[PDB]
């Protein structure tokens, strides 16, 4: 509750000159933000578990192995080994660190 | 018979002239022109899928609407002040414009001579003009009337609607008209109103007797008045939205079972979800087969099979279920456990990409699909030299702050690490 | 840039196929469709009216003659506001006044 | 006022060049007119 | 964070961190300052 009655303040900007439109540009933006945020999820919880997957015998730990693979895909989301290492980096900088970013260019810039 | 001879219609129908067999059967000496080499060479021209304009036979007298034969023939030979007076006094104006514009679209094609090919070119996009400023005028006095023009079957241009001539001839204008559009959606709401929104239908869907009430649209409101509900249960369910989000909740089940018996359910012994999911994607290919044999109209079997491989998504398809037989006689060897589970790790990750091919249904998401579809290319190219370029970073820096070392695992991987940091 | 600007056109165009499958599509979900399968399979053994259907010609004769009208309509307003373009009017007026020279010089 | 901006809005109306061009092309049928007629 | 049963109670305090903070307001930063530049 307080973070809802502390959303209010944003109410303030809407009497300012050159503010106002800024807020309804954002109010126009929140609709395709939101699915974006559906197709990023589900990519992400995909490479999770494929990683979990691979690189892990069946285990059934409930929250050691989970959470463990829980903090690995949101350590990721925040930002013979060596063949198949690189190859697993590799991917990941090739599909997350690029391709999503340019349809957020292309999207915000088109609503903008 | 009096064709100019310049023209590349005239050498066509020679061609197929000397190439028919009953006249040199007659005699070598006598060609002989009939009408129905002219119409089999039209049937080229103008698709397969039509039948023959002019029947092969087996006072004076008239074929049905000569003015389509006279306009056919106007057209051919790219005679443009002919043909727009010839049009202004057809009978079925629509679709005898939208079958010009498909035979000069595809004429403009093969004739290797660029001023004619560019003349024939902008009189086919003129008749495109023509054909969308007649449907305007028809659409704006009456609605639900002019729809049906989209749909009749003309026996004047070979028994087809005046949608697949649209449709085959790329004329993409004619496609995004607006009033096609709202038909489209019509088709695609089915039986119901088109008005009551998304979430409705999901709670609908979630809710058998809810239904029942009066929270849901119709149209047609003998339907929605006198309520049978067996009669409307069968109506809500023949709707092809109502067909999409079963599809799809049943494939994000798939994906969810698929996903839990390959965590922690990988068995050398065949377990019953392994039968389950087995015949789930045996259920899957069948379903992606019978839409290969449907082709009512008698058409190109092997053309059909190259429009199919074509397609992306049908590629990634196929690609999947190469993967996952493949990975299935690697599980059923016991020797091979461990490449089983990494391959069908990998078809986990294909199968989980199919999922993007919803939001091309959205109104707002497919044009950006189409943008990232376009963008690839490019990506890649900058991925190869930002690789190249810190490669080569990476090496002069294990090169200058280190002496000679033989380490294959220690101090290559340590550089490794440092050049990913 | 180079895109976004008539893309919509490409994605309305190919909005066609999948409305049509889908139409054509059996009702059941991918489980539970082998039996509908095995239905057709019976009618193996043993098109559509909204896409493409044949009309009866008492109605469609009316249906003709009401094209006939509107594009007759639509061509005497397109005839009209070609004659309303000023390059037009300028090319008439400049042949109009050779007349006028014509008849002046030749008294 | 409101006298005022109607002057003001039919004289600007008539600086068009459409519509001088369509007043010219009127006053030349009245030269043929009276060329032809006598 | 500025800088940049407990598994259902952490995803949804990280999920709505991703949802808000990584997003939006660059959105309005990119139109603010695009539209003055």
Not at chain 1, 60 to 77: C, E, K, P, Q
Not at chain 2, 390 to 407: D, M, P, T, W, Y
Request: neutral net charge.
């Amino acid at each position: 509750d307080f973070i809802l009655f502390c959303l209010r303040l944003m109410h303030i900007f809407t009497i300012s000159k050159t503010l106002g439109p800024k807020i309804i540009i954002v109010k126009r933006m929140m609709k395709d933000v939101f699915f974006f945020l559906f197709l990023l999820a589900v990519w992400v919880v995909s490479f999770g578990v494929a990683k979990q997957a691979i690189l892990i015998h069946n285990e059934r730990r409930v929250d050691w192995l989970f959470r463990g693979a829980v903090y690995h895909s949101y350590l990721t989301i925040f930002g013979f080994p060596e063949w198949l290492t690189v190859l697993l980096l590799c991917l990941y900088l090739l599909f997350t660190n690029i391709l999503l970013l340019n349809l957020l260019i292309a999207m915000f810039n088109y609503t903008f | 018979e009096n064709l100019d001879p310049s023209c590349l219609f005239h050498s066509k129908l020679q061609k197929v002239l000397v190439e028919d067999p009953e006249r040199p059967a007659c005699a070598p000496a006598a060609p002989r022109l009939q009408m129905h080499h002219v119409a089999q060479v039209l049937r080229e021209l103008l698709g397969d899928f039509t039948q023959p304009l002019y029947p092969r036979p087996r006072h004076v007298t008239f074929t049905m609407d000569p003015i389509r034969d006279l306009l056919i023939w106007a057209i051919v030979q790219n005679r443009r002040e002919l043909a727009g007076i010839i049009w202004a006094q057809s009978q079925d104006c629509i679709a005898a414009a939208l079958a010009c514009s498909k035979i000069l679209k595809e004429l403009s094609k093969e004739e290797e001579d660029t001023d004619s090919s560019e003349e024939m070119l902008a009189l086919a996009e003129e008749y495109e003009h023509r054909a969308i400023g007649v449907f305007t005028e028809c659409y704006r006095k009456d609605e639900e009337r002019a729809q049906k023009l989209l749909t009749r079957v003309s026996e004047a241009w070979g028994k087809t609607t005046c949608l697949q001539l649209a449709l085959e001839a790329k004329d993409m204008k004619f496609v995004s008209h607006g009033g096609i559009q709202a038909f489209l959606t019509k088709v695609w709401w089915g039986q119901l109103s088109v008005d009551n929104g998304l979430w409705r239908v999901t709670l609908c869907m979630l809710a058998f007797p809810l239904l029942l009430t009066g929270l849901i649209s119709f149209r047609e409101k003998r339907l929605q008045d006198v309520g049978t509900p067996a009669a409307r249960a069968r109506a809500f369910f023949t709707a092809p939205v109502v067909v999409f989000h079963l599809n799809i909740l049943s494939y994000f089940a798939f994906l969810c079972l698929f996903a839990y018996v390959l965590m922690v359910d990988f068995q050398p012994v065949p377990s019953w979800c392994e039968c389950a999911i087995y015949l789930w994607l045996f259920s899957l290919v069948c379903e992606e087969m019978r839409q290969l044999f449907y082709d009512p109209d008698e058409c190109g079997l092997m053309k059909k099979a190259a429009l199919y491989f074509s397609d992306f998504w049908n590629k990634l398809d196929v690609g999947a279920i190469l993967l996952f037989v493949a990975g299935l006689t690697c599980r059923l060897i016991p020797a091979t456990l461990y490449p089983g589970r990494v391959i069908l790790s990998l078809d986990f990750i294909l199968f989980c990409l199919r999922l993007m091919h919803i939001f091309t249904i959205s109104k707002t998401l497919g044009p950006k699909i189409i943008i990232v579809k376009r963008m690839m290319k490019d990506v890649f190219f900058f991925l190869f030299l930002l690789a190249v370029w810190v490669v080569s970073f990476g090496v002069a820096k294990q090169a200058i702050l280190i002496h000679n070392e033989r380490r294959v695992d220690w101090l290559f991987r340590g550089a490794v690490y440092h050049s990913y940091l | 840039q180079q895109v976004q600007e008539h893309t919509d056109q490409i994605w309305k165009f190919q909005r066609h196929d999948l409305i049509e499958e889908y139409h054509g599509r059996p009702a059941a979900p991918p489980p539970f469709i082998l039996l509908s399968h095995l239905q057709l399979f019976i009618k193996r053994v043993v098109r559509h009216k909204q896409l493409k259907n044949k009309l009866e010609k008492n109605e469609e004769a009316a249906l003709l003659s009401w094209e006939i009208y509107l594009k007759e309509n639509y061509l005497q307003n397109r005839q009209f506001q070609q004659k309303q373009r000023p390059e037009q009017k300028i090319e008439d007026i400049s042949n109009k006044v050779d007349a006028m020279v014509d008849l002046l010089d030749l008294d």
